[PDB]
Design a protein around this motif. Structure first.
Motif, mmCIF file in Angstrom:
data_model
loop_
_atom_site.group_PDB
_atom_site.id
_atom_site.type_symbol
_atom_site.label_atom_id
_atom_site.label_comp_id
_atom_site.label_asym_id
_atom_site.label_seq_id
_atom_site.Cartn_x
_atom_site.Cartn_y
_atom_site.Cartn_z
ATOM 1 N N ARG A 1 104.230 52.858 14.889
ATOM 2 C CA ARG A 1 103.228 52.648 13.850
ATOM 3 C C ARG A 1 102.847 53.974 13.204
ATOM 4 N NH1 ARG A 1 101.086 51.954 18.025
ATOM 5 N NH2 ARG A 1 101.110 50.142 19.428
ATOM 6 N N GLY A 2 103.848 54.772 12.855
ATOM 7 C CA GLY A 2 103.613 56.104 12.327
ATOM 8 C C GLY A 2 104.597 57.100 12.896
ATOM 9 N N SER A 3 105.756 57.225 12.258
ATOM 10 C CA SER A 3 106.840 58.000 12.838
ATOM 11 C C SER A 3 107.733 58.561 11.745
ATOM 12 C CB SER A 3 107.688 57.170 13.808
ATOM 13 O OG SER A 3 108.453 56.212 13.106
ATOM 14 N N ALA A 4 108.535 59.541 12.133
ATOM 15 C CA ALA A 4 109.499 60.130 11.224
ATOM 16 C C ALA A 4 110.804 60.347 11.972
ATOM 17 C CB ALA A 4 108.992 61.461 10.628
ATOM 18 N N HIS A 5 111.894 60.314 11.228
ATOM 19 C CA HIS A 5 113.203 60.657 11.745
ATOM 20 C C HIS A 5 113.620 61.957 11.064
ATOM 21 C CE1 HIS A 5 117.791 59.690 11.803
ATOM 22 N NE2 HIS A 5 117.464 60.585 12.718
ATOM 23 N N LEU A 6 113.870 62.997 11.857
ATOM 24 C CA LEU A 6 114.289 64.301 11.350
ATOM 25 C C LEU A 6 115.645 64.607 11.962
ATOM 26 C CD1 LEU A 6 110.837 66.067 12.084
ATOM 27 C CD2 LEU A 6 111.535 64.848 10.009
ATOM 28 N N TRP A 7 116.633 64.934 11.136
ATOM 29 C CA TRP A 7 117.969 65.130 11.676
ATOM 30 C C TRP A 7 118.555 66.451 11.210
ATOM 31 C CZ3 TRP A 7 116.579 61.285 8.294
ATOM 32 C CH2 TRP A 7 117.162 61.270 7.016
ATOM 33 N N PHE A 8 119.350 67.043 12.103
ATOM 34 C CA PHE A 8 119.851 68.402 11.992
ATOM 35 C C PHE A 8 121.355 68.389 12.198
ATOM 36 C CE2 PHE A 8 115.645 70.460 12.631
ATOM 37 C CZ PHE A 8 114.958 69.394 13.169
ATOM 38 N N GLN B 1 110.377 58.852 6.859
ATOM 39 C CA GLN B 1 109.182 58.476 7.613
ATOM 40 C C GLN B 1 108.816 57.023 7.361
ATOM 41 O OE1 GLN B 1 105.852 57.670 6.525
ATOM 42 N NE2 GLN B 1 106.295 57.783 4.333
ATOM 43 N N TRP B 2 108.112 56.441 8.334
ATOM 44 C CA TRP B 2 107.574 55.089 8.242
ATOM 45 C C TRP B 2 106.109 55.126 8.648
ATOM 46 C CZ3 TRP B 2 112.106 56.657 10.269
ATOM 47 C CH2 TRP B 2 113.296 56.110 9.771
ATOM 48 N N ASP B 3 105.222 54.707 7.742
ATOM 49 C CA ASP B 3 103.810 54.435 8.042
ATOM 50 C C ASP B 3 102.968 55.669 8.325
ATOM 51 O OD1 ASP B 3 104.663 51.421 9.812
ATOM 52 O OD2 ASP B 3 103.967 51.662 7.735
ATOM 53 N N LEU B 4 103.429 56.868 7.981
ATOM 54 C CA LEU B 4 102.560 58.032 8.089
ATOM 55 C C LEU B 4 101.479 58.003 7.015
ATOM 56 C CD1 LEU B 4 105.021 60.943 8.811
ATOM 57 C CD2 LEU B 4 103.721 59.502 10.487
ATOM 58 N N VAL B 5 100.352 58.640 7.324
ATOM 59 C CA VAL B 5 99.219 58.654 6.413
ATOM 60 C C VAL B 5 98.761 60.081 6.170
ATOM 61 C CG1 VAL B 5 98.521 56.353 7.150
ATOM 62 C CG2 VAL B 5 97.524 58.369 8.259
#
Lengths: 164, 263
Positions: free
Chosen positions: A143-150, A160-164
């Motif tokens: 309920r508030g996350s991000a995917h960061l890839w390298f 990101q999904w559902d960040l505020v």
């Protein structure tokens, strides 16, 4: 016990198939079918399935070594402080250290990490999941996350999904 | 059977949440048993059977190939991708994506398949065109699982889902090959062990698809029967419960035990 985050951290790149099964508990694990020659181990129930780890190997040989580690719901962030503002500050080209300084040193867990040229580090890929203060969940969806890839330790993209 | 209805109502009071239920005779379409059959429930991953039915309809009409390879990237990945996260280099065929979406509930697989058919709105148009004017998919993975109270997005009714599953598996909508392929994927379900399958006797057939969502949402659709052939459709949904996943699983499994005992 079942597969756990502790077991996931204890399994290392370069381990044999037997070393993996010994740490995970082979009754938790499976290969073949959808998972090919990878070893896939289940934890507690989560979502429509179970928390799990998937370990990829250099070949189908018995002496094959772990070149890939993936998990879902085994690891939890120690101090999740990601926000949309911090996500906005993450820029393609940043190092892993620069990203972690931006989103919070305890906001992320390793989603997947793969060494396509193992034992070399060339072309290594790393997917992190990072979480805002209430975004992580061990049994429901985030309920508030991000995917960061390298790739080669350099941020290639973010979502990101559902960040505020 | 009225003892199963007793069990469904008891599952309701033990979960503190609405439970929707229907038993359909597979060949005649006759409603054998039901509870809240015309109330709306979040589909969760049970929509992925309808998604792959739409994909197979495109294959039937020459618009799609099960062997077509789709190359995707890290930006495509969403939460819970047990199959798709292992094929970033090589991609996956449409057949492999439906397998992952149905048998493993893979969320990125379902989103990639939604893209091939044009999105949730196009799946809904497909359903509309086969006479289901109730079921609606509005969002993608993972947002479609939000299960906001009184929100009709991404919902079905037990009776609508049951009738639509019947048309997909036995009607003339899909070719025989696609009817068989869709049933085969559902029979190969890997993730619904603790649900109806845990009550199923030896020698029975089951092809199913489960789902889990926010606010205690849980559900399953299945074609099952004795003598190694499906003869009924069962649809079970619940949403709103604060009980644990194990307890929700047990309640659905016990409805299944009652369903099978009084077959």
């Amino acid at each position: 016990g079942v597969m756990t985050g502790a077991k996931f951290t204890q399994i290392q790149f370069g381990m044999t198939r037997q070393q993996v099964l010994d740490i995970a508990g082979a009754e938790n694990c499976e290969t073949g079918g959808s998972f090919g020659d990878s070893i896939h181990c289940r934890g507690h129930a989560a979502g429509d399935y179970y928390a799990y780890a998937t370990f990829g190997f250099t070949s189908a040989a018995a002496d094959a070594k772990v070149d890939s580690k993936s998990q879902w719901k085994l690891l939890a962030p120690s101090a999740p402080t990601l926000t949309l503002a911090k996500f906005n500050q993450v820029t393609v080209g940043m190092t892993r250290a620069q990203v972690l300084a931006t989103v919070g040193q305890g906001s992320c867990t390793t989603w997947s990490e793969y060494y396509p040229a193992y034992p070399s580090t060339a072309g290594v890929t790393l997917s992190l999941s990072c979480f805002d203060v209430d975004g992580y969940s061990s049994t429901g969806f985030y309920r508030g996350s991000a995917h960061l890839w390298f790739t080669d330790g350099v941020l290639q993209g973010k979502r990101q999904w559902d960040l505020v | 059977h009225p003892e199963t209805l007793v069990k469904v109502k008891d599952a309701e009071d033990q979960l503190g949440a609405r439970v929707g239920y229907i038993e359909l005779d597979l060949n005649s379409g006759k409603i054998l048993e039901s509870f809240r059959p015309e109330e709306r429930f979040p589909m969760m991953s049970t929509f992925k059977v309808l998604l792959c039915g739409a994909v197979l309809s495109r294959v039937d009409a020459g618009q799609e190939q099960l062997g077509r390879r789709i190359h995707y990237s890290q930006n495509d990945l969403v939460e819970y991708s047990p199959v798709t996260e292992k094929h970033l280099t090589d991609g996956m065929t449409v057949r492999e994506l439906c397998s992952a979406a149905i048998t493993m509930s893979d969320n990125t697989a379902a989103n990639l398949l939604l893209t091939t058919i044009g999105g949730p709105k196009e799946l809904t148009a497909f359903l509309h065109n086969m006479g289901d004017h109730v079921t609606r998919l509005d969002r993608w993975e993972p947002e479609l699982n939000e299960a906001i109270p009184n929100d009709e997005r991404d919902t079905t009714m037990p009776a609508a889902m049951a009738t639509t599953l019947r048309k997909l598996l036995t009607g003339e909508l899909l070719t025989l090959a696609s009817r068989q392929q869709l049933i085969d994927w559902m029979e190969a379900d890997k993730v619904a062990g603790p649900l109806l399958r845990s009550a199923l006797p030896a020698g029975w057939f089951i092809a199913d698809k489960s789902g889990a969502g926010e606010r205690g949402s849980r559900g399953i659709i299945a074609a099952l029967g004795p003598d190694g052939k499906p003869s009924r459709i069962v649809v079970i949904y619940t949403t709103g419960s604060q009980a644990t996943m194990d307890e929700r699983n047990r309640q659905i499994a016990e409805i299944g035990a009652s369903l099978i005992k009084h077959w």
